Amino acid sequence: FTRIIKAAGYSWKGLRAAWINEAAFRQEGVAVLLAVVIACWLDVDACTRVLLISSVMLVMIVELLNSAIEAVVDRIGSEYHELSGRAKDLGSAAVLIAIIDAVITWCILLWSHF
Amino acid sequence: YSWKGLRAAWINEAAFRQEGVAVLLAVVIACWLDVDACTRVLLISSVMLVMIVELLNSAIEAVVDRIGSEYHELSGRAKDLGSAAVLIAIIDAVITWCILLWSHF
Amino acid sequence: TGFTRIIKAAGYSWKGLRAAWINEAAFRQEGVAVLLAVVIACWLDVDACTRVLLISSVMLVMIVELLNSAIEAVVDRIGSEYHELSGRAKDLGSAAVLIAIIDAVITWCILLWSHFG
Ligand SMILES: CCCCCCCC/C=C\CCCCCCCC(=O)OC[C@H](O)CO
Ligand SMILES: CCCCCCCC/C=C\CCCCCCCC(=O)OC[C@H](O)CO
Ligand SMILES: CCCCCCCC/C=C\CCCCCCCC(=O)OC[C@H](O)CO
Ligand SMILES: CCCCCCCC/C=C\CCCCCCCC(=O)OC[C@H](O)CO
Ligand SMILES: CCCCCCCC/C=C\CCCCCCCC(=O)OC[C@H](O)CO
Ligand SMILES: CCCCCCCC/C=C\CCCCCCCC(=O)OC[C@H](O)CO
Ligand code: NA
């Protein structure tokens, strides 16, 4: 059980860090709470309820990997002094597809539901 | 940041072009089928996930490259692991389509 | 396009999985929890929309942990060149893996508790 607390600390440290620093993460964190509430207050099925919640949760997972990747690029920024931003672009592409995915999910599921 | 990356993947990555095609295909096929929403959503978003992961694998490979590639076993490990992540995504999407359709028939 | 290449990429990927399993212990443990979970998903009498969600939620945990593992491998590569690491990137990666797990836990709960009365 010793490693699990070390890891969860890391995870929490990572999360607390994203929240202070990334404005978009604060927005997505907000989106998860609503997604939860809206999904729970609406009379829908579980398969719908999971997907309304899970699609949005995926946005967060991806903004979190993107933020990790951006953090690496920046460590190199300080030493190389090279501007190539190819990685940060690709990470942002990933986050966009994640968001689109959630939008589609929500449209399709709510459009069915209503 | 966002749009610049996708045009980059399409021009440079063949697999991304292949998955990007699969994404609209999946969408068309998903809408063409008479299924419920949970079904339709899962058909699309599974293929979409493959694309999302492929993009992250692509970012990572790009960072590996920005550092001089030289020779190192932590560079290759990264590209390989990232390469594996895309595979589980593809495997996942493949299973998904099976389960939904074997059922559908 | 060049389709001969698909086996080459598939090599790399397999190399990557073997890599994760040998080196990352957390990959082994979650993989155990995940493989167990997947198997249970196949034996449960649920609908297809339910079954897919049970499997894929858990599979994402694997997919996310694998990207974290790629990420950390890059941090380790920088570690050789530079001296001080913030740990900030590796932390975010650990966060991503957690949110993945929580999602799978939430999925499974919501789907089982709902579906089972
Ligand atoms: C129906 C059942 C619903 C179950 C519930 C679903 C929960 C969603 C999962 C994760 C949320 C992650 C939130 C991330 C918060 C990061 C920490 C943070 O913001 O810290 C504040 C900071 O310390 C100020 O100084
Ligand atoms: C009354 C009609 C029925 C209710 C209809 C919805 C009403 C509230 C809208 C959205 C909730 C949040 C989920 C929206 C899905 C996409 C979320 C997303 O991807 O967010 C990206 C992120 O916030 C970028 O910073
Ligand atoms: C119940 C039903 C069970 C169904 C079981 C299905 C098993 C076979 C699955 C997929 C085929 C193999 C696809 C191999 C693709 C490898 C290419 C790859 O991973 O490319 C990533 C690359 O690194 C670029 O970023
Ligand atoms: C349409 C419904 C499909 C549902 C089932 C599939 C779901 C995954 C989606 C696309 C796989 C795309 C595969 C592209 C080729 C393998 C991946 C790759 O990276 O290949 C590199 C190679 O060099 C390239 O030729
Ligand atoms: C009605 C109540 C139902 C309750 C249902 C609860 C269980 C949910 C199942 C799987 C989630 C986790 C699957 C993905 C793997 C996570 C990895 C993990 O948990 O690792 C622990 C670690 O290995 C320890 O040493
Ligand atoms: C029916 C399914 C069969 C299998 C049953 C398995 C049950 C596991 C459930 C919950 C564990 C949740 C534990 C979450 C611990 C924190 C994870 C974390 O922080 O992971 C980050 C780390 O860096 C990663 O490498
Ligand atoms: Na690649």
Side-chain angles (χ1 to χ4, degrees):
Chain A
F1 280 104
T2 322
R3 172 195 73 79
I4 289 181
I5 311 300
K6 209 191 294 279
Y10 290 150
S11 296
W12 174 253
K13 191 181 168 210
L15 280 164
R16 174 153 164 208
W19 182 272
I20 300 293
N21 298 283
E22 325 289 0
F25 182 78
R26 285 193 304 277
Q27 280 173 0
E28 298 155 10
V30 151
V32 171
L33 175 44
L34 257 70
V36 162
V37 173
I38 296 170
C40 285
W41 161 68
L42 280 185
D43 188 20
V44 284
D45 45 297
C47 300
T48 298
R49 184 171 290 110
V50 159
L51 292 170
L52 283 182
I53 286 168
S54 294
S55 53
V56 163
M57 290 270 273
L58 178 75
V59 170
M60 259 202 27
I61 294 173
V62 181
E63 173 75 71
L64 275 169
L65 288 170
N66 178 56
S67 280
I69 295 166
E70 292 179 353
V72 193
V73 176
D74 301 354
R75 181 66 164 88
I76 292 161
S78 47
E79 322 262 324
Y80 265 59
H81 308 327
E82 172 188 345
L83 276 194
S84 194
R86 170 108 203 268
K88 274 189 172 186
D89 284 338
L90 288 158
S92 273
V95 186
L96 175 61
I97 305 301
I99 284 169
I100 283 174
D101 188 79
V103 169
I104 294 174
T105 293
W106 276 68
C107 275
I108 287 183
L109 288 180
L110 294 196
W111 279 349
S112 174
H113 178 44
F114 295 111
Chain B
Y1 291 151
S2 299
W3 288 47
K4 194 177 171 207
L6 281 167
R7 188 57 190 165
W10 182 269
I11 298 177
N12 309 145
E13 320 285 0
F16 178 81
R17 282 195 304 278
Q18 284 174 2
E19 296 151 7
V21 152
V23 167
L24 70 97
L25 257 67
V27 163
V28 163
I29 296 171
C31 283
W32 186 292
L33 282 183
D34 189 20
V35 290
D36 46 303
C38 299
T39 300
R40 196 182 315 272
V41 158
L42 289 171
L43 284 180
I44 295 166
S45 72
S46 52
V47 165
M48 293 220 84
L49 178 80
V50 172
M51 177 196 267
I52 291 172
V53 178
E54 176 72 71
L55 274 168
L56 291 171
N57 172 48
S58 281
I60 290 167
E61 291 177 352
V63 195
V64 172
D65 298 350
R66 158 139 202 218
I67 299 156
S69 233
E70 300 152 30
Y71 282 97
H72 214 271
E73 331 273 8
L74 292 170
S75 293
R77 200 196 278 167
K79 276 186 173 185
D80 283 337
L81 288 155
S83 185
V86 179
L87 171 60
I88 312 301
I90 293 168
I91 289 279
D92 185 84
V94 165
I95 293 172
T96 294
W97 276 70
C98 277
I99 290 181
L100 288 181
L101 298 194
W102 173 278
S103 177
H104 188 46
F105 289 24
Chain C
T1 45
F3 284 103
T4 316
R5 292 87 177 107
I6 289 181
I7 313 301
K8 163 189 175 190
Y12 294 152
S13 299
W14 170 246
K15 194 176 173 206
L17 278 166
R18 277 205 56 184
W21 184 271
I22 304 294
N23 297 283
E24 324 288 0
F27 176 82
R28 296 182 236 115
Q29 281 179 0
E30 298 153 8
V32 150
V34 155
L35 181 41
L36 267 213
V38 160
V39 169
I40 286 171
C42 285
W43 284 337
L44 270 180
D45 187 18
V46 290
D47 45 303
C49 294
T50 299
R51 194 180 313 271
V52 160
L53 293 171
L54 284 182
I55 288 168
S56 75
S57 52
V58 150
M59 293 266 268
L60 184 80
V61 174
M62 291 304 96
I63 297 172
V64 178
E65 174 71 70
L66 273 167
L67 291 172
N68 174 52
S69 283
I71 278 168
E72 294 180 353
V74 195
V75 180
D76 298 351
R77 176 63 171 86
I78 283 163
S80 49
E81 304 293 312
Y82 307 140
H83 279 192
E84 63 171 328
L85 292 171
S86 50
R88 274 202 290 274
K90 273 191 170 188
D91 282 338
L92 289 158
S94 272
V97 174
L98 174 61
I99 304 301
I101 288 169
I102 285 172
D103 189 86
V105 167
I106 288 175
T107 288
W108 276 70
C109 277
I110 286 182
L111 285 183
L112 295 195
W113 175 272
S114 176
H115 184 43
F116 280 25

